Amino acid sequence: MASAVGEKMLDDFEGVLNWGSYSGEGAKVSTKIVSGKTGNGMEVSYTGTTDGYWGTVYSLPDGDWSKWLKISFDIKSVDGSANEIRFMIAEKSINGVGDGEHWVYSITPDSSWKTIEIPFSSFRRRLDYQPPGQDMSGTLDLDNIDSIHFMYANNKSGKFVVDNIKLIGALE
Numbered sequence: 001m002a003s004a005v006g007e008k009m010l011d012d013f014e015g016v017l018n019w020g021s022y023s024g025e026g027a028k029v030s031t032k033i034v035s036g037k038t039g040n041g042m043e044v045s046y047t048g049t050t051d052g053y054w055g056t057v058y059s060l061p062d063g064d065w066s067k068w069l070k071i072s073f074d075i076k077s078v079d080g081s082a083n084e085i086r087f088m089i090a091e092k093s094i095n096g097v098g099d100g101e102h103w104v105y106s107i108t109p110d111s112s113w114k115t116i117e118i119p120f121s122s123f124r125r126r127l128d129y130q131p132p133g134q135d136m137s138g139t140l141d142l143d144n145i146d147s148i149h150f151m152y153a154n155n156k157s158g159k160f161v162v163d164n165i166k167l168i169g170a171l172e
């Protein structure tokens with residue numbers, strides 16, 4: 001730890017890749033490390049179909065960040081396209097099986113680097129799909145997070161880079 005601003009880095013891609021990519025049923029993925037907005041970055045590549053799927057997954061060491069934190073990441077498009085993607089956040093189960101609640105938000109990139117900061121206040125529940133070992137609170141609980149997922153939100157192809165994935169929070 002360093003005795004400064006409440007900013008907490010999560011990932012910055014300066015070491016070996018540590019994310020869980022997947023696709024299927026006529027949809028496809030490809031993924032590797034690159035040069036990023038700072039030092040190294042990660043680049044992903046996707047191919048869609050109307051009923052197929054693609055995504056990639058991060059496993060947190062620490063999963064409470066309530067009272068005042070926001071998230072921030074840097075992103076840029078390497079197809080030039082403004083492809084529609086979504087985040088999904090899984091909450092902890094009160095039973096200790098699977099997940100407790102599923103929360104979503106859709107976003108779009110640009111052809112130059114963008115610093116996407118989100119206050120967590122923009123997310124909603126996944127409406128047709130939720131887990132059985134649930135909390136069902138209608139509150140996204142930054143006391144008790146389980147995992148985070150990047151996912152398809154469209155059926156076309158696309159390619160992009162990401163870096164600088166952190167929590168932010170100060171008086172400024």
Ligand SMILES: [Ca+2]
Nearest residue numbers: 012036038040
């Ligand atoms: Ca970096």
Ligand SMILES: [Ca+2]
Nearest residue numbers: 101135137139
């Ligand atoms: Ca909840």
